[PDB]
Write a protein that binds this DNA or RNA. Sequence first.
RNA 1: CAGUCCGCGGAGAAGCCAUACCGGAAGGAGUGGUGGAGCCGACUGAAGUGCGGAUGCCGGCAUGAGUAACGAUAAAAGAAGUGAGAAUCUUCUUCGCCGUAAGGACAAGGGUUCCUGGGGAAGGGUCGUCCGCCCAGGGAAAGUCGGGACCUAAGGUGAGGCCGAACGGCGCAGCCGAUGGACAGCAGGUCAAGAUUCCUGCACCGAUCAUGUGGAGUGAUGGAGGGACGCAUUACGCUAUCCAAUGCCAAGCUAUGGCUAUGCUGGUUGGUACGCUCAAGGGCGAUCGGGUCAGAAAAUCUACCGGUCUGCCUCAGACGUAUCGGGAGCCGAAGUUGGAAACGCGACGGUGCCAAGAAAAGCUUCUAAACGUUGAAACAUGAUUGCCCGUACCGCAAACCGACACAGGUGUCCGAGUGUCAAUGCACUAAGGCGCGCGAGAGAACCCUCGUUAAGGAACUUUGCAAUCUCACCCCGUAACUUCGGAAGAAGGGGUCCCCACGCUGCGUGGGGCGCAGUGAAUAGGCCCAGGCGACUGUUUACCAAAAUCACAGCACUCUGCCAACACGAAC
RNA 2: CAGGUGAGCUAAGCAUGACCAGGUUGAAACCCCCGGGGGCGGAGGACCGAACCGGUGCCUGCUGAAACAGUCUCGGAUGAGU
RNA 3: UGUAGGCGAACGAGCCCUGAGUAGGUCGUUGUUCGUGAAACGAUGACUGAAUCCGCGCGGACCACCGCGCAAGGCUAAAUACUCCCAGUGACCGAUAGCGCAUAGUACCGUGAGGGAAAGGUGAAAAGAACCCCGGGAGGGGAGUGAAAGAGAACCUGAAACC
RNA 4: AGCUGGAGAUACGCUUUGACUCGGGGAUGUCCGAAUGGGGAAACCCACCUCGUAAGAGGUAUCCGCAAGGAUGGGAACUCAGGGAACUGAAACAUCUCAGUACCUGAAGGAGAAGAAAGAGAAUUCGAUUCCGUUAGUAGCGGCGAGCGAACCCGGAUCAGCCC
Lengths: 46, 93
Amino acid sequence: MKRTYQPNNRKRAKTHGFRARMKTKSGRNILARRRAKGRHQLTVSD
Amino acid sequence: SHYDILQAPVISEKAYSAMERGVYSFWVSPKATKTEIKDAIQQAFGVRVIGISTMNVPGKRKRVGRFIGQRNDRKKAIVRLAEGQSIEALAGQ
RNA sequence: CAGUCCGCGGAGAAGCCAUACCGGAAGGAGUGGUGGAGCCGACUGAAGUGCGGAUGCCGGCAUGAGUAACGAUAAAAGAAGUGAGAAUCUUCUUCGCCGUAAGGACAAGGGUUCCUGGGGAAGGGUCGUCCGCCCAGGGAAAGUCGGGACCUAAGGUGAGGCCGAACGGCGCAGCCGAUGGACAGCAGGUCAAGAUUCCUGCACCGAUCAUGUGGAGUGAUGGAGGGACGCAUUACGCUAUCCAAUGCCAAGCUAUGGCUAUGCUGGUUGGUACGCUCAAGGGCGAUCGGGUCAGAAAAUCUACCGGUCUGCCUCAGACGUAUCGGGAGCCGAAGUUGGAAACGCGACGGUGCCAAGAAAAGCUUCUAAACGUUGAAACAUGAUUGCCCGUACCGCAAACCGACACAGGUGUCCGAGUGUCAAUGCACUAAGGCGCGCGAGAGAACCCUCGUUAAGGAACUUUGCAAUCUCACCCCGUAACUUCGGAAGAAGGGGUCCCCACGCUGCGUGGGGCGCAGUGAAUAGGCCCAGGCGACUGUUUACCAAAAUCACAGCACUCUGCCAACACGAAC
RNA sequence: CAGGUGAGCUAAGCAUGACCAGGUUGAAACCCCCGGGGGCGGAGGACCGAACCGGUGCCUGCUGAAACAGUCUCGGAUGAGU
RNA sequence: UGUAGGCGAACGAGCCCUGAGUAGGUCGUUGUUCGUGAAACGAUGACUGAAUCCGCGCGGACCACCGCGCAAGGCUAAAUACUCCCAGUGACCGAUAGCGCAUAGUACCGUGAGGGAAAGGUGAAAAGAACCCCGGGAGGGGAGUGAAAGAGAACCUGAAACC
RNA sequence: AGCUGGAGAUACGCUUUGACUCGGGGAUGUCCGAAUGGGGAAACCCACCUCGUAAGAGGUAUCCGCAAGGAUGGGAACUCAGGGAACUGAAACAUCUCAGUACCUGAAGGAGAAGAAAGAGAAUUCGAUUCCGUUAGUAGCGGCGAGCGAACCCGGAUCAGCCC
Ligand SMILES: [Mg+2]
Ligand SMILES: [Mg+2]
Ligand SMILES: [Mg+2]
Ligand SMILES: [Mg+2]
Ligand SMILES: [Mg+2]
Ligand SMILES: [Mg+2]
Ligand SMILES: [Mg+2]
Ligand SMILES: [Mg+2]
Ligand SMILES: [Mg+2]
Ligand SMILES: [Mg+2]
Ligand SMILES: [Mg+2]
Ligand SMILES: [Mg+2]
Ligand SMILES: [Mg+2]
Ligand SMILES: [Mg+2]
Ligand SMILES: [Mg+2]
Ligand SMILES: [Mg+2]
Ligand SMILES: [Mg+2]
Ligand SMILES: [Mg+2]
Ligand SMILES: [Mg+2]
Ligand SMILES: [Mg+2]
Ligand SMILES: [Mg+2]
Ligand SMILES: [Mg+2]
Ligand SMILES: [Mg+2]
Ligand SMILES: [Mg+2]
Ligand SMILES: [Mg+2]
Ligand SMILES: [Mg+2]
Ligand SMILES: [Mg+2]
Ligand SMILES: [Mg+2]
Ligand SMILES: [Mg+2]
Ligand SMILES: [Mg+2]
Ligand SMILES: [Mg+2]
Ligand SMILES: [Mg+2]
Ligand SMILES: [Mg+2]
Ligand SMILES: [Mg+2]
Ligand SMILES: [Mg+2]
Ligand SMILES: [Mg+2]
Ligand SMILES: [Mg+2]
Ligand SMILES: [Mg+2]
Ligand SMILES: [Mg+2]
Ligand SMILES: [Mg+2]
Ligand SMILES: [Mg+2]
Ligand SMILES: [Mg+2]
Ligand SMILES: [Mg+2]
Ligand SMILES: [Mg+2]
Ligand SMILES: [Mg+2]
Ligand SMILES: [Mg+2]
Ligand SMILES: [Mg+2]
Ligand SMILES: [Mg+2]
Ligand SMILES: [Mg+2]
Ligand SMILES: [Mg+2]
Ligand SMILES: [Mg+2]
Ligand SMILES: [Mg+2]
Ligand SMILES: [Mg+2]
Ligand SMILES: [Mg+2]
Ligand SMILES: [Mg+2]
Ligand SMILES: [Mg+2]
Ligand SMILES: [Mg+2]
Ligand SMILES: [Mg+2]
Ligand SMILES: [Mg+2]
Ligand SMILES: [Mg+2]
Ligand SMILES: [Mg+2]
Ligand SMILES: [Mg+2]
Ligand SMILES: [Mg+2]
Ligand SMILES: [Mg+2]
Ligand SMILES: [Mg+2]
Ligand SMILES: [Mg+2]
Ligand SMILES: [Mg+2]
Ligand SMILES: [Mg+2]
Ligand SMILES: [Mg+2]
Ligand SMILES: [Mg+2]
Ligand SMILES: [Mg+2]
Ligand SMILES: [Mg+2]
Ligand SMILES: [Mg+2]
Ligand SMILES: [Mg+2]
Ligand SMILES: [Mg+2]
Ligand SMILES: [Mg+2]
Ligand SMILES: [Mg+2]
Ligand SMILES: [Mg+2]
Ligand SMILES: [Mg+2]
Ligand SMILES: [Mg+2]
Ligand SMILES: [Mg+2]
Ligand SMILES: [Mg+2]
Ligand SMILES: [Mg+2]
Ligand SMILES: [Mg+2]
Ligand SMILES: [Mg+2]
Ligand SMILES: [Mg+2]
Ligand SMILES: [Mg+2]
Ligand SMILES: [Mg+2]
Ligand SMILES: [Mg+2]
Ligand SMILES: [Mg+2]
Ligand SMILES: [Mg+2]
Ligand SMILES: [Mg+2]
Ligand SMILES: [Mg+2]
Ligand SMILES: [Mg+2]
């Protein structure tokens, strides 16, 4: 009974990846929003 | 220049049993390419290399005191020499 | 809490704990017991200032209660070991269970779960000396496999360029982008743990150089060919691979009542090189010349056009010699004959069809420019060079997605035998793998999955819902109706096993035999009459509705003359 | 209401690869005897039935083995397929 | 150890002209209290389009007079705002309070954007329990150390439910 | 005179020709990132050009300009600007308010903005800009409803006007 999470590394990083977020002002906003919150992770890149 | 490249000889029973065969193995810096390590061996000990192989090795991920961490990633590298083998006589002694 | 007084305190503060005392109450004292470092009383000031409730919040602990369960009904039993302790860990011998899997290999995806030595808290639905858990230490090797240093599809980009309050939206070339094209090795061995990687044997690839032959033409981001492709069927040869035997080889027995082997068990070739050896199948016509208007121009290469005469090439695979391996076994034997046979190989085969089935580089062939034409192209041998990333282990699952050691799902490849028309089906079983991580009794009511059932047979009930019954193959026989195809497996009846003789290519013909019974066990249609609705195959409400819904060919209206009507859109 | 995050589930599209045991039926076309009989051929949104895809009816499950399943039964199964 | 006071550095930071495609206007609109209101003025999208010093804009429809002022070119500290960071301070909190964190944007939850915890206390000083006993342990009893082991590392007190 | 990071642990040792530690400069500074040789799924792939012995070093994006030499990105809140809500109030709800609030986006600095009168204004006064008090809920705006709300005078903080 198929589940929501089928992992896929190229998909996980093509979406969600730091280079992917940097392409868009929303994603650069996600990046700085995380740097400010001070997360250790910041992206699926880590 | 190249002495820095050779992080440490590999220990262990298998590397010793190979060292009986005239092949020698050591850990080297993960950034190192095959050509530079061949040349670094030919500099550091003066023998000619005749065969090579290498293998990146992620460290075993170990934990102390409920602090879990990755260990440094090695790069093992094994090399066979021509008939003037024996390296420096730093065998098992 | 604050200001100011009064003071107290390791001969012991607050806090905590009992207490019959005290004020009208909120309250406050006395004494005792912990405690071990700050604190009471009075006056004043300020407040986050008084809790039983909000299916209030954080927290701890109850009741249900030693109750339900311990995660598939594929069962387990004895010995022997270890050990502080064993129903559970180790080993041995039986047992049972999967076997187009519940075996094996991959891709994902996970990340040390792999191996060795140790451990026993917690995780393991019980135990635990064990583990996929904890500790420490090892294991992971590539010029040839996959990717990259090559190419392109969709898609995403995108100097220039087109737009747009901004951020930005597009957008030719080019570039990225495998799921595709392209491309050089196989056989064997083995750590505890890696293997087309390492070792052993022997190949190939490209590159550089040398020796020599040759001793001169090379011959581009440009042209051309080609690479370059659908589906269904299907002829011929063959391999993988499996079957048989009084073929060979290897080893030993046997006994129970018998067989003394013609019985039993096991094995019965992989690679490479070389052949005036056998071989289906497959490919291919061949130059001379003309025209400019064709490929930008060029061109000796293509296209167009005219003239000109079975054969070549090829090995799939087989057979022999050699060799190198492997090889049952107690270091090394044999390797035969007959048959079966792929979706694999020959091949880019034939034939039919209509829905008319990528691109691009590598590659072959041409000239342009340029470099030379007494140190060419090419070939032969020797030598030299061979970069990066991945490879452990799990990988239909106890190691991935399901919060779990989860009855769920998860793409590709291989998947033996006996029998049965066939088969990847059904039953048993090889290899291999496993008994699903609580057990032991007992044999009440009740409940779940089941077996048989007198007589009756649908009386049951909304309804024959459920459970029977029917069951595979062969022969005979089958209606109203029909769009002539069908209804049709209509219905209905008959056969089915063993032996012998005979005929034909396992069937048919006769006969005999045994049982209750002969698709003997497993898989394996109940059927008919008559309506309604929808023609039909199909599609649907993930998880209460699969239908008469939706779509469908066919039909009709109507629009739209090409920057078409129509739609997405900050947007000439 | 605003600006984002999501097509890794699912709803479709596109590019590109792959998969569908076995058995039944026997359309044209083609060829003979007189549209009919024979051969031959191998067509289909044809038949049966494994994978696979799907969920038809009961039951079980209902603080589940599972936040939608299980046994049995059933639909398709070369096409509008997976 | 500081505090008051004092010294203190090679290098170190720090006070005839005077702005036109415009002023003006019509049409759409808007800002200051300005919602078409009698609606001036600025402000611009579209179309238009003056004057020069006896000249031009305003004085809230508009006119005359009377006053204020010179547009269509530019630069310009300081007083002003905030507080990532530093010091000082508090009729601020003191481990459910106080920042979410006595540290952690961690663990954990989510494909993602994002959400998001509990927190603490030996003792003066480790003197952190030699050694003996029962137990594989774990745990415990002695002995010692220590003022206290009525502190012993599940280490301040140790209330209530509850056993 | 000790030091040898937290870190509590051993060993190896450094220091009175000055350690450590503290202030000040220097020098190294792998790869990603505006990332900028080219590609890309950040931290990894693949190149070219000069030094040329080699190990090793330097350059290879775009925009403005001859040329120096600037620019790209980041920054908690604060500033200005281009866009611009809706709950909500109105006891319904359109104008209205909520509000130029929230939000997005751009530019920039330690601030920014604004600023040196074709002004306010009604005394023929004032004489840049910003900020506080006040005038004052006055004027006024408003389905003249809910509600919205100045400015001058005056008092302070700071006061420089310079250039084409
Ligand atoms: Mg799910
Ligand atoms: Mg990464
Ligand atoms: Mg090698
Ligand atoms: Mg622990
Ligand atoms: Mg006392
Ligand atoms: Mg009392
Ligand atoms: Mg004390
Ligand atoms: Mg107090
Ligand atoms: Mg309160
Ligand atoms: Mg009450
Ligand atoms: Mg309560
Ligand atoms: Mg509670
Ligand atoms: Mg009971
Ligand atoms: Mg029970
Ligand atoms: Mg159960
Ligand atoms: Mg046993
Ligand atoms: Mg015994
Ligand atoms: Mg013993
Ligand atoms: Mg025990
Ligand atoms: Mg034994
Ligand atoms: Mg398997
Ligand atoms: Mg992987
Ligand atoms: Mg293991
Ligand atoms: Mg082990
Ligand atoms: Mg245990
Ligand atoms: Mg246990
Ligand atoms: Mg076990
Ligand atoms: Mg490698
Ligand atoms: Mg090799
Ligand atoms: Mg490749
Ligand atoms: Mg684009
Ligand atoms: Mg591609
Ligand atoms: Mg591929
Ligand atoms: Mg190849
Ligand atoms: Mg060995
Ligand atoms: Mg192996
Ligand atoms: Mg096919
Ligand atoms: Mg026999
Ligand atoms: Mg030629
Ligand atoms: Mg297949
Ligand atoms: Mg190309
Ligand atoms: Mg493997
Ligand atoms: Mg791996
Ligand atoms: Mg679940
Ligand atoms: Mg499972
Ligand atoms: Mg098979
Ligand atoms: Mg079989
Ligand atoms: Mg069979
Ligand atoms: Mg089966
Ligand atoms: Mg397994
Ligand atoms: Mg078991
Ligand atoms: Mg039953
Ligand atoms: Mg009966
Ligand atoms: Mg009857
Ligand atoms: Mg009745
Ligand atoms: Mg009925
Ligand atoms: Mg009914
Ligand atoms: Mg029924
Ligand atoms: Mg009739
Ligand atoms: Mg008929
Ligand atoms: Mg029948
Ligand atoms: Mg009989
Ligand atoms: Mg009979
Ligand atoms: Mg039978
Ligand atoms: Mg049966
Ligand atoms: Mg229908
Ligand atoms: Mg059908
Ligand atoms: Mg439904
Ligand atoms: Mg249903
Ligand atoms: Mg156009
Ligand atoms: Mg069909
Ligand atoms: Mg039919
Ligand atoms: Mg469906
Ligand atoms: Mg049916
Ligand atoms: Mg107007
Ligand atoms: Mg009005
Ligand atoms: Mg707190
Ligand atoms: Mg507390
Ligand atoms: Mg937090
Ligand atoms: Mg974590
Ligand atoms: Mg203890
Ligand atoms: Mg005690
Ligand atoms: Mg105590
Ligand atoms: Mg303790
Ligand atoms: Mg104390
Ligand atoms: Mg205590
Ligand atoms: Mg210390
Ligand atoms: Mg880069
Ligand atoms: Mg870039
Ligand atoms: Mg209202
Ligand atoms: Mg409203
Ligand atoms: Mg704002
Ligand atoms: Mg902003
Ligand atoms: Mg900026």
